[PDB]
Amino acid sequence: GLSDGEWQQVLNVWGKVEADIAGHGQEVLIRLFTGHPETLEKFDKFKHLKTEAEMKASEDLKKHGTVVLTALGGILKKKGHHEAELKPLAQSYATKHKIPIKYLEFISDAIIHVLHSKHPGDFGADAQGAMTKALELFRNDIAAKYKELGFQG
What would the x/- binding string for ligand HEM be over residues 70 to 89, using CB under 6 A? -xx-----------------
What is the three-class DSSP state of 146?
Answer: helix
Closest contact distance (angstroms) between CB of 153 and ligand HEM is 14
- Based on its alpha-carbon atoms, the radius of gyration of the chain, rounded to whole angstroms, reads 15
- Minimum Å gap between C-beta 129 and ligand HEM is 19
Give, as ranges, the residues between 124 and 153 that touch ligand HEM (CB under 6 A): none
Examine residue 45 and tell whether it contacts ligand HEM (CB under 6 A): yes
Question: Among candidates 105, 92, 107, which has minimal Cα distance to 146?
Answer: 92
Query: What's the rounded Cα separation, in Å, for the pair 13 and 16?
Result: 6
**Residues 39, 55, 76, 123: which binds ligand HEM (CB under 6 A)?**
39
Please tell me the count of residues contacting ligand HEM according to CB under 6 A.
13
Q: Note the helical H segments in the chain.
A: 4-18, 21-35, 37-40, 52-57, 59-76, 83-95, 101-118, 125-149
- Residue numbers at the binding site for ligand HEM (CB under 6 A): 39, 42-43, 45, 67-68, 71-72, 97, 99, 103-104, 107
